[PDB]
Amino acid sequence: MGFLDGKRILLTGLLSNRSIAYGIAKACKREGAELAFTYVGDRFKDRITEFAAEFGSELVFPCDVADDAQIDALFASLKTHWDSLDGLVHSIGFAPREAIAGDFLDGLTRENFRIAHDISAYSFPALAKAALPMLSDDASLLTLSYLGAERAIPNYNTMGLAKAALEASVRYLAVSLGAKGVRVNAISAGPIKTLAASGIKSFGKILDFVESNSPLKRNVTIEQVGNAGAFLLSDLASGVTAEVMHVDSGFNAVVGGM
Amino acid sequence: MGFLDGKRILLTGLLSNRSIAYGIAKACKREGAELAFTYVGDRFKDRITEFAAEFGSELVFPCDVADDAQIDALFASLKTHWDSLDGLVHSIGFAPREAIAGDFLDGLTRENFRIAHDISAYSFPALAKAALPMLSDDASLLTLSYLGAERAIPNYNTMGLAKAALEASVRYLAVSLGAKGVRVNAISAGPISGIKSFGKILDFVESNSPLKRNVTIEQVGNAGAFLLSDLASGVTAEVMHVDSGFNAVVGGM
Amino acid sequence: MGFLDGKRILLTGLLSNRSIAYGIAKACKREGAELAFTYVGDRFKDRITEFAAEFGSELVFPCDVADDAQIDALFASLKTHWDSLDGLVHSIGFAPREAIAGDFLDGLTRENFRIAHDISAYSFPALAKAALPMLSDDASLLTLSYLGAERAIPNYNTMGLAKAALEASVRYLAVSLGAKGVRVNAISAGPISGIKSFGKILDFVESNSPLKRNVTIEQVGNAGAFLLSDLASGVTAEVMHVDSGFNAVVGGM
Amino acid sequence: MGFLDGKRILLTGLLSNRSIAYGIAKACKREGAELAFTYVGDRFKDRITEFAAEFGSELVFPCDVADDAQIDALFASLKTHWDSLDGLVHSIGFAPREAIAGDFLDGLTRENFRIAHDISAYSFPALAKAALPMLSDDASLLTLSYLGAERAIPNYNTMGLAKAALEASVRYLAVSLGAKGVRVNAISAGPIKTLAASGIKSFGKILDFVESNSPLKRNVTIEQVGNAGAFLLSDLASGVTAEVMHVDSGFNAVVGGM
Numbered sequence A, D: 001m002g003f004l005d006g007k008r009i010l011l012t013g014l015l016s017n018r019s020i021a022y023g024i025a026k027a028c029k030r031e032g033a034e035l036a037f038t039y040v041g042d043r044f045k046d047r048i049t050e051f052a053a054e055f056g057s058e059l060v061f062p063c064d065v066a067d068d069a070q071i072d073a074l075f076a077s078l079k080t081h082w083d084s085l086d087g088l089v090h091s092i093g094f095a096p097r098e099a100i101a102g103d104f105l106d107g108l109t110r111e112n113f114r115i116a117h118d119i120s121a122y123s124f125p126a127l128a129k130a131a132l133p134m135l136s137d138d139a140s141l142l143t144l145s146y147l148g149a150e151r152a153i154p155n156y157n158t159m160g161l162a163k164a165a166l167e168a169s170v171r172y173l174a175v176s177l178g179a180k181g182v183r184v185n186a187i188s189a190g191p192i193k194t195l196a197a198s199g200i201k202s203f204g205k206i207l208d209f210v211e212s213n214s215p216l217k218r219n220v221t222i223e224q225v226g227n228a229g230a231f232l233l234s235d236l237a238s239g240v241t242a243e244v245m246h247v248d249s250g251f252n253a254v255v256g257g258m
Numbered sequence B, C: 001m002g003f004l005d006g007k008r009i010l011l012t013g014l015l016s017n018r019s020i021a022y023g024i025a026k027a028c029k030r031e032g033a034e035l036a037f038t039y040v041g042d043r044f045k046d047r048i049t050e051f052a053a054e055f056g057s058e059l060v061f062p063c064d065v066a067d068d069a070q071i072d073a074l075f076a077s078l079k080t081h082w083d084s085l086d087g088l089v090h091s092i093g094f095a096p097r098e099a100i101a102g103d104f105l106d107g108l109t110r111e112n113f114r115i116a117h118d119i120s121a122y123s124f125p126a127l128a129k130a131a132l133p134m135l136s137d138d139a140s141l142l143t144l145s146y147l148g149a150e151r152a153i154p155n156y157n158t159m160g161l162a163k164a165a166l167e168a169s170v171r172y173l174a175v176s177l178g179a180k181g182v183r184v185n186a187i188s189a190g191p192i193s194g195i196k197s198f199g200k201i202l203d204f205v206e207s208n209s210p211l212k213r214n215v216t217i218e219q220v221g222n223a224g225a226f227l228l229s230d231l232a233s234g235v236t237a238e239v240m241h242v243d244s245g246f247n248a249v250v251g252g253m
């Protein structure tokens, strides 16, 4: 009797047990969703398969969002298992490292900019468009953003631009798809420690500053982000579209550190 | 089973079966909350008692939020039934009628400004402060707001000012109460009857919103039950739109 | 041939040569404006008179903005000197001291809230309304705000709420006054003595703002002059940050 | 005498006396600045040369912002004439036609997305980066954006995403350059009628709606946008950076049509 009962939700970005996508998956499964997952590259298939099985699913598909054919095949393959799709979680972002270390301009090149946007902003509406023919009439699309879209956070740099584009795509997609009853949202999550953050030099300080300065005085968890994800993907949030929802212990709403 | 199981929640602002507080009350009860209600004066005692009965409740209290003594006596009477409070819903908003019709300037007075801000903004942190001694560490406080806080809406007038104050109090409250663990949020609900100019708004929203429909008290209620629950434990200092996407477009062009 | 040539501008809140109001007067005077000034209290009359002479003006008027009849008298008297008014600077902000120190709830009382809103928010549209019969069609109204309207700042507390309502009154005034052609804006000024928490803010802004300096009353004065002039004739309902970009960052990490 | 006396300012995007760049050039020249101009394509050399002559200038340089070599050579050429640069006006934006007509997903393709963001967003911080070694200690860089960055506007589509990134780049540029005294802002101009807008099928409808609903009940003029631009470029605005200033008759701040 969970609030996502019988719902069919496809999740991208589940790379480890630290992943935001892992949190959303746990929360969706708890609430009775049926889940499917995507992965990048042939060799990653046992790993996503093991995660999927621990959520009662054997539904896993390759998708490198850089590649048009993989985006089309993804949904073509999903359709042989699922007649329609109720939920879509887009939890992917990447810019070449040098575009997010040090100075914004030192790390800016046309190629760095192009890649960060292609992968971190473009992919979301491209997934939506590819999904559209099989979306149910009350489907819900969710993307992951971060406060750096709204305000300049030190080495976030080129990713800030691409997150701002992604949030705008949340508004444009809502208008497009809403005519079909489909909802589109983002969660602007607080920082979360993953393996990929080990190469981010200021990450420890960000975590420290957020713990010390957010209203709840704690970093957020993938359980919290997960549960908010599940709500936005459910019928409980049918009044809600085009929204950027902060799940960040309130951090965005303060001027910390003074 | 339900996501508000055993949660004890106090609702202010219930006036009819079409109130947002009614939608929130319905959704909270379905998810397993125990409910309490306020009313403003013996004139509304009977309506409100009867709504509480519908939700299996007998905890109904007078509270005119112009009155500090009534605010304090509320939680003193509440404390005789409940050791601690998990949730507060603020759904009270008022300005004298002339302050929300016609032109902003022409109908503005200090009195009307005073009352609007007193009833519609001050009263939320005031309930919050009077509640604090009995608030559980992971309590959740929810106010209701409107897009007129953010952008100028014809005839919303002094209410737009008072709702902006309301949304800033959400932020200062979250900072103040947060170390304890208490969360503070609003829903910026779309419109939900029968005034002429209301009609025109309802039509414009239905036409122009991303989802091409007005929101319901069911939808607002569910989003509220969510913010009042532990599912929302990551979320505080948020003004969440529940409007069909309307805030997010430039309609009508 | 300065950009406010011939323009007649009334300024409130001039208290010292360290006032934002003093910066705006000075820039306005450099660009060719004629100035008038309000003050509060017969103890202050000679200082405002002295300030006003420094700017080539002998027009000073009493106006306690808490008092309706002084607001009306203000423009009754100004009218005996100027046929029409081109600019208005609203630079008054007050909350009782406890309401801007320490915890938000601790310093929250109805009286503290009522007063902070009455003086800091209500008084802006109130002046606008009283001035309307004598405003030129291309008049420009300017208020001062601060970032605590937007996001919770540590001691700003009650005043955060009043500034939020102030920024909304800017938008509603823009709609209410714009057909005639009047423009209404705010500057959200960064900090510019006394407080130890203040030195803390000053240092934080200086370290973290994109321009790595605090703003001055010259910088806020030049921006005010611009918004008061025909150069800004396209700009209304705006809250312009003059804060070295501070609002635009997450500092301290 | 003028509030931009002795300032040397380079302006892109001047196509005709209807361009926003033309408004800004004219205000700037009135206030005492010396000007230089970019143009795209040799077919346009003559026109832009007459505009520059009209502004008492003969400094015109070719610059397709799609092309790194041209961006680099622009500043190399500019340097043979000017010691330093005090102003930069970025007034350029483009997405393929289909990406700005009709439904957002309809004209969404990877290449349309790439072109829109490359020309409309990337080109701003790239000009700033190429300009950096000659920027004066109080230089001011100014870009033009539009309300479509903030809320979804009906055919604005891919260009809303590009303007959102551009607005985020204002903030990143402002942190990156700001320690050396350099200011960075956008003007979010209300719609302005050029030969390009026509059409753009909805443009007359937008113009009518902005006129009926804006606080000032009128569309903005290039003179108004030009004067605000002139201000941001001056020492009058030396307290102002990382700002997106609306010059749109207050239109952004209302809910129109109800």
Ligand SMILES: Cc1c(CN(C)C(=O)CCc2cnc3c(c2)CCC(=O)N3)oc2ccccc12
Pocket: A093, A094, A095, A096, A097, A100, A145, A146, A153, A154, A155, A156, A157, A159, A191, A192, A196, A197, A199, A200, A202, A206
């Ligand atoms: C927070 C935060 C994050 C996490 N986050 C919210 C993000 O949105 C993305 C982080 C990210 C994006 N792309 C890459 C990497 C990290 C690492 C290695 C790589 O090749 N590409 O990353 C930051 C980078 C700099 C500053 C802050 C942050």
Ligand SMILES: Cc1c(CN(C)C(=O)CCc2cnc3c(c2)CCC(=O)N3)oc2ccccc12
Pocket: B093, B094, B095, B096, B097, B100, B101, B145, B146, B153, B154, B155, B156, B159, B191, B201
């Ligand atoms: C929407 C909308 C609403 C609903 N809403 C979101 C509100 O926030 C408050 C509405 C409201 C506040 N105070 C009073 C009344 C209505 C009616 C009678 C009375 O004596 N006082 O009211 C409007 C009034 C004018 C314009 C728009 C709206």
Ligand SMILES: Cc1c(CN(C)C(=O)CCc2cnc3c(c2)CCC(=O)N3)oc2ccccc12
Pocket: C093, C094, C095, C096, C097, C100, C145, C146, C153, C154, C155, C156, C157, C159, C190, C191, C201
């Ligand atoms: C900056 C900053 C300021 C300046 N600012 C932008 C303000 O808006 C200050 C407003 C203010 C309001 N009420 C009073 C006082 C100042 C002084 C003395 C008094 O009795 N009442 O004030 C703060 C108060 C707390 C935290 C930061 C700040």
Ligand SMILES: Cc1c(CN(C)C(=O)CCc2cnc3c(c2)CCC(=O)N3)oc2ccccc12
Pocket: D093, D094, D095, D096, D097, D100, D145, D146, D153, D154, D155, D156, D157, D159, D191, D192, D196, D197, D200, D202, D206
């Ligand atoms: C206003 C408004 C404008 C003006 N504006 C603010 C813009 O940013 C326009 C941008 C634009 C981008 N790409 C192209 C064109 C214009 C014309 C011709 C072409 O081939 N490509 O354009 C719109 C497009 C759709 C909806 C509204 C608007």
